Amino acid sequence: TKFYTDAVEAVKDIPNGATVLVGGFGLCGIPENLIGALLKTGVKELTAVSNNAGVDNFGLGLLLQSKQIKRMISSYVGENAEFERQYLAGELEVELTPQGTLAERIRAGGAGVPAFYTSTGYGTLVQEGGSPIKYNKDGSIAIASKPREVREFNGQHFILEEAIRGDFALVKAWKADQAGNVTFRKSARNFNLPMCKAAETTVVEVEEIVDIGSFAPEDIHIPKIYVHRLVKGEKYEKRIERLSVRKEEDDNVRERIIKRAALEFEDGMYANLGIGIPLLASNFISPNMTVHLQSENGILGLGPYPLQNEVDADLINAGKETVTVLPGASYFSSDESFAMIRGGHVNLTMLGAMQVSKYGDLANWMIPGKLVKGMGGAMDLVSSAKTKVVVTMEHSAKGNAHKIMEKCTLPLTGKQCVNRIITEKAVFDVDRKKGLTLIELWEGLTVDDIKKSTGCDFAVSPKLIPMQQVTT
Amino acid sequence: TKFYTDAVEAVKDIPNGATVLVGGFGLCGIPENLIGALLKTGVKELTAVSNNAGVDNFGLGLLLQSKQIKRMISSYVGENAEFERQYLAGELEVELTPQGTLAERIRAGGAGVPAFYTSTGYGTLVQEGGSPIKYNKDGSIAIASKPREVREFNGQHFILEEAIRGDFALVKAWKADQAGNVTFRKSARNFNLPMCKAAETTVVEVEEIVDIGSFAPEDIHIPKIYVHRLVKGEKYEKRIERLSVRKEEDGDNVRERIIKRAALEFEDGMYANLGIGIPLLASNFISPNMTVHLQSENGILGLGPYPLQNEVDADLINAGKETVTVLPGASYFSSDESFAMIRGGHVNLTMLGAMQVSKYGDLANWMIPGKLVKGMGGAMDLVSSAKTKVVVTMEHSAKGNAHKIMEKCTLPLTGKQCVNRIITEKAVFDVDRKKGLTLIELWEGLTVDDIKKSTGCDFAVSPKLIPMQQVTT
């Protein structure tokens, strides 16, 4: 490992048009010093593979303000006006890539694997092609993503994804011993670890340089062999995107859904809760019951929002909110996180949606010409059969428009992957083959009421009960 | 995580004919209590995917003595007489699998990846099929391995390997907190970590159960979510296969020459992987003012010298299964990581022995039909990346001056066009995938003609040919 004193000196040779890997989830664990060094360097036309676009005024956003980037390969690009700005206006090429696939591809880039099969994205724009890579001053598409090959294994369909590896990697880490061994703190690991292995030249910036022997050999997250260039960051502003604190002393259609979704929790289960209703549902989990919450950005065992003195920029949930962690929790890289999810190790995946098909098709990541912020990890989260996925959403849309239907209108997140639907009016069990059946009806409504608020037809369970709730 | 008091109670429901993953490298980090439980259970006709066959009287060997296994999926099956007797007799089916692909396949099994591409094995029996899975008395092949699909990416050839995942996994670990979080000690990790994620039901036996909060969250090796059943081992005999100690006060001629010349391949700050024998002995001559980092396939970076009497530890051994030491700033990692590292070409130099080397770099060092069938270990992965310089160290010729270097190898290949340099006691050849060999060093006393009649292929003579170098200093 070659040590540097100056960040610029370390990235000084990145060529224009180079493919650069940039670690960090949101603003957590981002290489702010190395990114600042690229501003001075002025290198341009970069194809930056990064999970997110940071924020307007910080993180990868800075390189966007300076127009130093031509290609973005990310999973979620929200909360960045200058970005979606450049994206929509056709000033930037973007390859919306499912988070899980992004992590695996990068790992493949460093493990000698040119390509691999994954079910994430099948039956989606990712697999079929047509995803907008570059617009041209119009909703019209200048450059559309291309189809991924499809092959089936053991009766399921998978698509071929090729390894990603850059010329350089800008990873952020916590500590480094004088030999070059690197470790990461809390959820700041995410993409930094895998990216540290998939680039010709790896550049790591650490908060502290400790001497050899400080780390237990079994506990080195990234062995020195992967750290080509190291430098201690000069300035760390611990920028926090969303501050969510709680005090130690704490509508209707939504209250109903939340209280019903809360009943999906079982003792000892592992669940991944999407932003909003599903996450709020966890608040009603019986204190005598214990559920383990997994966070896509690399966490297992997330707790409540932090108290004033618990806020830590290195610990946030998938929604970019400052979080806490319960005892016996654990941290892991993004490739790990998605190996876990993709492998169906999570018991329950609850998330919102805009439309659900009769047989389980899901749509919750894109509204053509109005919502193109990326799919995040949604496509991976519903990619396995060994994982029960239930969507929590209002029964019908603005003006009583069907949300549940024969076929979705909006681009899919995945085919036949929803197992259960929970609205404020009903609860449907959904099956890939026989369709959806009603198993719970809200007190006051009738099968007819549901009949005229559901785009398609459905069976009625002979054991149909009034929809349940749980304030206790 | 469900905790058990009895090992038997934990593996009680493994069905006959089940596919069971069994952790451990050699006798390091093997689940001896769970294996003992299967002896009592008596479950039979198992397909055991394990890196090795342990030894005759211990490890997976025990399950072989009791004939409880019908299929072995391993990378190296040596040091087990009962094993080969069964294999040669045709009573045991074996799928010799390259160590690196064995690790990747298992990880794929737990990460939702049905299949992936790797260059390990291309141009080999693994890729073209024909590897002996099951013999019949007379010595022929009853069941031969089948070909892996070939596809090229960015100008290189790769083969398709499918994920491996069992019904059960018997992994050995160091500690577990009361929540179920597991950690591994030294090189005892190897296959235990990845296997703990690729089975319907995972059973982990630990040396000790600590309470929650004992582990730093970012340092938990296997999160509780993967540990289905946990039990504390009742008996651990820290069995050591090969004791190698050194005293704090310390080959022939043709062997000394090669070693002293191979020692000159070391450069300051490089990362190297040294095969057993000459390449490893060469490391002994590394200038003390020079620092080289030694990689160990079983999951180690920064190997040191053999341990002193009070340093011997069954959890720390090299690829050759010898008890080893570790230098400061060293690190430990799983077998899948170890091979991601190797396969990704992160190691600078790979030195290993060989039986035959082709004119363009083909290598043969894992199988002699009907005389040496112990598996390729990690040899096929170690020479699979273009980025890693691979040099073979071997005696120039065989008995009766039979050629070792030639146009095409006779013995089954370890890899095609992968050797970059050959070092014998007579010469040093630089080898190129296209332009063949190039003599660059000649030993004092021999002539190009001498080399001409001890080499089976043409070779160019470098205009800067120097007398072969040595280094006692």
Side-chain angles (χ1 to χ4, degrees):
Chain A
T1 303
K2 183 178 182 181
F3 291 63
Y4 294 68
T5 287
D6 187 298
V8 172
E9 198 60 12
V11 299
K12 170 178 67 180
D13 61 321
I14 297 173
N16 286 321
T19 297
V20 176
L21 316 180
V22 181
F25 182 76
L27 295 182
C28 189
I30 62 178
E32 45 186 296
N33 289 286
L34 294 182
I35 292 174
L38 292 200
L39 286 178
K40 299 180 182 176
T41 248
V43 58
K44 72 176 190 297
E45 293 181 295
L46 302 172
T47 156
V49 1
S50 180
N51 190 55
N52 315 118
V55 189
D56 289 282
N57 191 215
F58 194 79
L60 209 78
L62 299 174
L63 267 52
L64 288 174
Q65 277 183 353
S66 62
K67 271 57 88 70
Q68 305 188 233
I69 299 171
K70 76 164 298 185
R71 253 270 175 122
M72 284 283 280
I73 302 182
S74 336
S75 77
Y76 179 80
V77 298
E79 290 55 62
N80 194 308
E82 176 58 6
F83 185 153
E84 40 188 1
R85 229 199 87 280
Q86 303 185 17
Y87 186 14
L88 294 168
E91 307 172 6
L92 175 59
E93 297 176 1
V94 181
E95 249 185 282
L96 295 180
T97 309
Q99 194 169 171
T101 292
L102 183 64
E104 257 308 278
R105 289 177 66 185
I106 292 175
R107 170 185 185 275
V113 173
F116 62 98
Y117 282 103
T118 179
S119 65
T120 292
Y122 175 67
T124 247
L125 283 176
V126 174
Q127 173 263 305
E128 290 291 324
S131 179
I133 287 178
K134 181 183 180 178
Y135 292 108
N136 49 197
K137 267 67 173 59
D138 289 66
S140 56
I141 304 173
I143 304 178
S145 72
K146 284 178 170 46
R148 300 299 190 249
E149 301 179 6
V150 174
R151 179 165 176 167
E152 90 173 73
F153 293 81
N154 317 100
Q156 191 181 324
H157 285 64
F158 298 93
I159 63 175
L160 187 65
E161 291 291 9
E162 306 194 8
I164 288 175
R165 80 185 302 290
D167 303 294
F168 283 84
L170 307 179
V171 330
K172 167 49 155 50
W174 181 24
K175 297 175 180 176
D177 59 25
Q178 297 182 301
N181 297 307
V182 166
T183 63
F184 305 95
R185 184 195 157 84
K186 312 294 186 65
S187 66
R189 194 185 304 192
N190 55 88
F191 285 77
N192 286 302
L193 190 148
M195 292 181 154
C196 198
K197 306 168 188 173
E200 249 290 332
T201 298
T202 298
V203 187
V204 175
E205 71 164 87
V206 292
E207 286 170 30
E208 207 191 320
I209 288 184
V210 69
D211 37 3
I212 305 178
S214 301
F215 306 137
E218 29 282 87
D219 295 307
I220 286 175
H221 307 157
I222 284 293
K224 57 197 175 190
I225 193 176
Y226 293 128
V227 182
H228 310 321
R229 303 174 190 174
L230 184 73
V231 56
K232 174 181 174 187
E234 291 183 4
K235 172 186 179 179
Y236 288 114
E237 39 191 301
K238 306 298 187 67
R239 182 74 119 276
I240 293 178
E241 183 170 356
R242 305 188 195 184
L243 185 56
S244 289
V245 187
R246 81 174 196 295
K247 299 159 296 302
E248 196 170 4
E249 58 181 1
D250 302 303
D251 44 297
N252 199 188
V253 299
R254 156 173 274 207
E255 184 201 312
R256 261 147 61 184
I257 302 176
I258 294 177
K259 290 185 175 178
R260 161 57 212 194
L263 279 169
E264 292 296 325
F265 294 118
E266 297 174 357
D267 189 46
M269 79 166 207
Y270 296 88
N272 183 296
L273 307 180
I275 55 186
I277 289 180
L279 182 49
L280 289 172
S282 73
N283 285 300
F284 295 76
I285 292 179
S286 171
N288 144 290
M289 181 187 277
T290 172
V291 310
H292 302 303
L293 297 183
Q294 191 259 28
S295 206
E296 354 182 349
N297 56 309
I299 317 178
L300 183 50
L302 23 169
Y305 292 129
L307 286 175
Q308 187 59 289
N309 59 294
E310 284 177 348
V311 56
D312 184 340
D314 297 324
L315 220 200
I316 59 177
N317 56 43
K320 274 68 175 177
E321 290 172 336
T322 52
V323 197
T324 251
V325 109
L326 305 171
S330 59
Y331 294 116
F332 36 85
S333 68
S334 297
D335 47 304
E336 240 321 293
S337 179
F338 283 93
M340 182 173 152
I341 289 172
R342 210 185 301 113
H345 296 277
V346 174
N347 302 147
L348 177 66
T349 286
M350 275 206 293
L351 70 189
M354 307 175 285
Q355 307 184 325
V356 184
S357 152
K358 173 181 178 182
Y359 298 102
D361 292 355
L362 180 58
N364 80 329
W365 72 284
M366 178 184 110
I367 298 175
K370 239 62 183 181
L371 178 69
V372 197
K373 318 282 285 303
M375 72 280 271
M379 298 200 166
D380 301 273
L381 285 163
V382 309
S383 74
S384 89
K386 300 186 176 183
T387 298
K388 165 173 48 182
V389 10
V390 6
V391 312
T392 55
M393 62 174 193
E394 293 189 4
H395 203 91
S396 298
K398 189 75 174 178
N400 217 116
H402 291 310
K403 275 192 177 184
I404 303 181
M405 49 213 271
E406 292 285 352
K407 300 300 294 180
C408 294
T409 287
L410 302 173
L412 301 183
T413 292
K415 279 184 181 178
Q416 317 184 318
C417 60
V418 182
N419 302 110
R420 169 123 97 204
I421 305 173
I422 296 177
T423 77
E424 76 286 4
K425 301 185 173 187
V427 168
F428 289 96
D429 260 347
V430 32
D431 182 72
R432 322 186 181 310
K433 293 298 185 59
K434 48 187 173 188
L436 59 164
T437 76
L438 179 60
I439 65 175
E440 301 201 6
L441 203 190
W442 191 65
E443 57 186 297
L445 306 177
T446 70
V447 169
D448 271 323
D449 291 353
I450 304 303
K451 173 86 76 297
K452 53 188 60 179
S453 284
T454 300
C456 62
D457 54 8
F458 55 77
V460 178
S461 171
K463 299 305 178 180
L464 173 62
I465 62 175
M467 182 166 300
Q468 302 175 294
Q469 294 289 252
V470 283
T471 293
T472 304
Chain B
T1 303
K2 183 178 181 180
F3 291 63
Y4 293 69
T5 287
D6 187 298
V8 172
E9 198 67 25
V11 300
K12 169 178 66 180
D13 61 321
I14 296 173
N16 286 321
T19 295
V20 175
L21 317 181
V22 180
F25 181 78
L27 296 183
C28 186
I30 63 179
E32 45 186 296
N33 289 283
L34 295 181
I35 291 174
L38 292 199
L39 286 177
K40 298 181 182 176
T41 248
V43 58
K44 64 173 190 285
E45 296 178 294
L46 302 174
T47 289
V49 2
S50 177
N51 189 55
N52 316 114
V55 292
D56 291 281
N57 78 318
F58 195 78
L60 209 78
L62 299 173
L63 266 53
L64 289 175
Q65 276 183 172
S66 62
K67 286 63 102 67
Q68 304 189 232
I69 299 171
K70 75 164 301 184
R71 259 287 236 274
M72 286 282 283
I73 303 184
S74 337
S75 77
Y76 179 80
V77 298
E79 290 55 64
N80 194 309
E82 175 58 6
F83 166 85
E84 70 172 355
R85 170 192 156 283
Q86 287 194 47
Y87 183 33
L88 297 175
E91 303 172 3
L92 178 59
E93 296 176 3
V94 181
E95 250 185 281
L96 296 180
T97 310
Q99 194 170 172
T101 82
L102 183 63
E104 256 308 279
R105 288 176 68 185
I106 294 176
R107 146 220 134 293
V113 172
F116 61 98
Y117 283 103
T118 177
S119 64
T120 292
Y122 175 67
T124 248
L125 283 177
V126 174
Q127 172 264 305
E128 55 193 60
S131 176
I133 287 178
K134 180 183 180 177
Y135 292 107
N136 44 52
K137 318 72 170 55
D138 68 69
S140 56
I141 305 175
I143 304 177
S145 71
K146 285 179 169 46
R148 303 274 123 112
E149 301 179 4
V150 174
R151 178 165 177 169
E152 89 174 72
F153 293 81
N154 318 99
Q156 191 181 325
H157 285 63
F158 298 92
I159 63 175
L160 188 64
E161 291 291 7
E162 306 194 8
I164 289 175
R165 79 185 303 290
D167 303 295
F168 283 84
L170 307 177
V171 331
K172 166 50 155 50
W174 181 23
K175 296 176 181 175
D177 60 23
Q178 297 182 300
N181 297 306
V182 167
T183 63
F184 304 95
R185 185 194 157 83
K186 313 292 186 64
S187 68
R189 195 185 304 191
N190 55 88
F191 286 77
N192 286 304
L193 189 150
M195 293 180 156
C196 199
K197 307 168 189 174
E200 249 291 331
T201 299
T202 298
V203 188
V204 179
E205 69 165 89
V206 292
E207 286 169 31
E208 208 164 2
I209 291 182
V210 310
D211 37 2
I212 305 179
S214 299
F215 307 137
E218 38 280 84
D219 294 310
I220 283 173
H221 306 158
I222 283 294
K224 57 197 176 190
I225 194 177
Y226 293 128
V227 182
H228 311 321
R229 303 175 190 173
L230 182 53
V231 56
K232 174 182 175 186
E234 291 183 3
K235 171 185 179 179
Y236 288 113
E237 39 192 300
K238 306 298 187 67
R239 182 75 118 275
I240 293 177
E241 184 170 356
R242 292 172 179 165
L243 186 56
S244 290
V245 187
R246 82 174 196 295
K247 299 160 296 302
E248 196 169 4
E249 58 181 1
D250 301 303
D252 45 296
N253 171 209
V254 330
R255 207 156 188 277
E256 186 200 312
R257 261 147 61 184
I258 302 176
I259 294 176
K260 290 187 176 177
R261 161 57 212 195
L264 280 170
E265 293 295 326
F266 294 118
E267 297 174 357
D268 189 46
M270 79 169 210
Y271 296 86
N273 182 298
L274 308 179
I276 66 176
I278 289 179
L280 182 50
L281 289 173
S283 73
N284 286 299
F285 295 77
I286 292 179
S287 171
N289 59 51
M290 179 187 271
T291 170
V292 311
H293 302 303
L294 295 184
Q295 207 280 352
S296 206
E297 65 180 64
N298 56 309
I300 318 176
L301 181 52
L303 288 173
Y306 292 128
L308 285 175
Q309 187 59 288
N310 60 294
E311 284 177 348
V312 56
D313 183 343
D315 297 324
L316 219 200
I317 59 177
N318 57 42
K321 294 138 65 186
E322 291 171 335
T323 52
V324 179
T325 251
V326 108
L327 304 171
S331 58
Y332 295 116
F333 36 84
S334 66
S335 294
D336 47 303
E337 244 310 299
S338 177
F339 283 93
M341 181 174 150
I342 289 171
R343 210 186 300 113
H346 297 278
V347 174
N348 301 148
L349 177 66
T350 286
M351 274 207 292
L352 71 189
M355 290 162 228
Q356 307 184 324
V357 184
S358 151
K359 174 181 177 183
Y360 297 101
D362 293 354
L363 181 58
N365 80 332
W366 72 283
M367 177 182 107
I368 299 176
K371 301 172 183 178
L372 179 69
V373 197
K374 309 296 172 55
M376 67 281 96
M380 299 198 165
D381 301 273
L382 285 161
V383 309
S384 76
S385 71
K387 195 173 172 182
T388 299
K389 175 180 175 172
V390 12
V391 5
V392 312
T393 54
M394 62 171 192
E395 293 190 4
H396 203 92
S397 299
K399 219 78 169 183
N401 207 67
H403 293 307
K404 276 193 177 183
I405 303 181
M406 50 213 273
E407 292 285 353
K408 300 300 294 181
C409 295
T410 287
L411 303 172
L413 300 184
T414 292
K416 278 183 182 178
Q417 317 183 318
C418 60
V419 182
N420 303 111
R421 171 173 294 171
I422 306 174
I423 295 176
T424 77
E425 75 286 5
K426 301 185 172 187
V428 168
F429 290 97
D430 261 347
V431 32
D432 181 73
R433 298 170 84 278
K434 291 298 186 60
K435 62 181 180 185
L437 310 180
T438 287
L439 179 59
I440 64 176
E441 301 200 7
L442 204 191
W443 192 65
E444 192 181 9
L446 305 177
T447 70
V448 169
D449 234 290
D450 291 352
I451 303 303
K452 173 86 76 298
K453 53 187 60 179
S454 285
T455 301
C457 61
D458 298 323
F459 70 82
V461 176
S462 172
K464 299 306 177 181
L465 174 62
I466 62 175
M468 182 166 298
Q469 302 175 294
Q470 294 289 251
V471 282
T472 293
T473 304

